[model samples]
Target: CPGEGEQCDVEFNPCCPPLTCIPGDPYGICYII
Candidate 1:
């Protein structure tokens, strides 16, 4: 899994390929895209 402070909901989708935005505790997390 990735770490915090990483980008999200940006122009190019912050997460790596095959990972999408998921509900996080206080922010968004990356899951299967």
Candidate 2:
């Protein structure tokens, strides 16, 4: 995971909590709080 202001390989959508499923490149599957 990226730091407070560190750059990440892909953009993360923290708003999308409980991301049961995610389909796409880089972030194939993710789990948000």
Root mean square deviation (Cα) for candidate 1: 5.6
TM-score of each: 0.31, 0.21
Cα error, residue 26 of model 2, in Å, equals 9.8
Candidate 2: stretches off by over 4 Å: 11-33
Candidate 1 at residue 29, lDDT? Answer: 67
Q: What is the C-alpha lDDT of each candidate?
A: 0.52, 0.37
Give me candidate 2's TM-score against the actual structure. Answer: 0.21
Q: What digit string (tens of lDDT, one per residue) describes model 2 on residues 1-33? A: 433322323456322433432342344444343
Q: How close is candidate 1 to the true structure, as a TM-score?
A: 0.31
lDDT for model 1: 0.52
